[PDB]
Amino acid sequence: LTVAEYLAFEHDYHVLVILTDMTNYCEALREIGAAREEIPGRRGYPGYMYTDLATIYERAGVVEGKKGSVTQIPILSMPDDDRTHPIPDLTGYITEGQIQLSRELHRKGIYPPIDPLP
Amino acid sequence: MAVIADPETAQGFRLAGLEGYGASSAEEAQSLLETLVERGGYALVAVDEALLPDPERAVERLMRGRDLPVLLPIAGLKEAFQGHDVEGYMRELVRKTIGFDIKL
Amino acid sequence: VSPTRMNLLQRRGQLRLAQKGVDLLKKKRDALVAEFFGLVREAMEARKALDQ
């Protein structure tokens, strides 16, 4: 995101950023938090995970008086296809929407299996 | 309405306005009955028990599609005068409908 | 289904609804039984009148 911000706001590029799996980032964060005996959040994750994720997502946007822009498409895996897991919950609280894939549509051979209601 | 019965009462059926046919075997009774089912006209067919005890069993594949035809079994001319108890038919009817045998 | 307390309350409400529905269907079946008995008596009487 440092490289993306530099390119967009200093050289007027239109940057598209893809983050492959935020779940692994949360796992590493939980490892460091559990090593330090922090107060846990709901399942295992530390209580400050909302603030830490917010410093990553909130770096996108557009700026008055400049031609650049930053667009983010993070990808994350809901573990038991569960929307109430802490990682999708905090991501949905921070981000500006979501695209949710459906397994039932995938089993019928539909591609791309985007479920429009959630 | 139509009625399959003995040839003796067919003239009386024609007098009363009923469409009567005279027959004695189950094969011709079933063929004529399903012909009456397929043909356009009156939807009620009356059956003498001597030719076909259960006409619904005869048209059970035409009954699965449409239930608008009406079939009614009754004693024949010979069975009418010698007579029987109709309550046995009632017991068979209730035992068929519920699957249970009660109230002899 | 994710286990939460709210989900547990919803499931218990569903259980109570199912039991009440079972009881209501039993009452409906009782009423249908009474009507069936009356109708079969009437049908027997009509059958013997037709025979005569």
Swiss-Prot record, chain A:
Coiled coil start-end: none
| Domain of life of the organism encoding this protein | Bacteria
Q: Family membership, please give it.
A: Belongs to the ATPase alpha/beta chains family.
Function as written in the Swiss-Prot or TrEMBL entry: Produces ATP from ADP in the presence of a proton gradient across the membrane. The V-type beta chain is a regulatory subunit.
Designated name of the protein: V-type ATP synthase beta chain
Q: What species was this sequence derived from?
A: Thermus thermophilus (strain ATCC 27634 / DSM 579 / HB8)
Lineage of producing organism: Bacteria, Thermotogati, Deinococcota, Deinococci, Thermales
Q: Identify the gene encoding this protein.
A: atpB
From Swiss-Prot, chain B:
Cysteines paired by S-S bonds: none
Query: Per the record's keyword annotation, is Transport included, yes or no?
Result: yes
For the biological process aspect of GO, one term held by this record is:
proton motive force-driven plasma membrane ATP synthesis
**Pfam family of the protein (one):** ATP-synt_F
UniProtKB keywords: ATP synthesis, Hydrogen ion transport, Ion transport, Transport
Described purpose of this protein according to its UniProt entry: Produces ATP from ADP in the presence of a proton gradient across the membrane.
Family stated for the protein in its record? Belongs to the V-ATPase F subunit family.
Protein's recorded name: V-type ATP synthase subunit F
From Swiss-Prot, chain C:
Superkingdom as given in the UniProt entry: Bacteria
Q: Show the disulfide pairing.
A: none
Q: Which family does it belong to?
A: Belongs to the V-ATPase D subunit family.
Q: Which residues of the full protein are shown?
A: 4 to 55 of 223
Q: What does this protein do?
A: Produces ATP from ADP in the presence of a proton gradient across the membrane.
Query: What is the protein named?
Result: V-type ATP synthase subunit D
| Originating species | Thermus thermophilus (strain ATCC 27634 / DSM 579 / HB8)
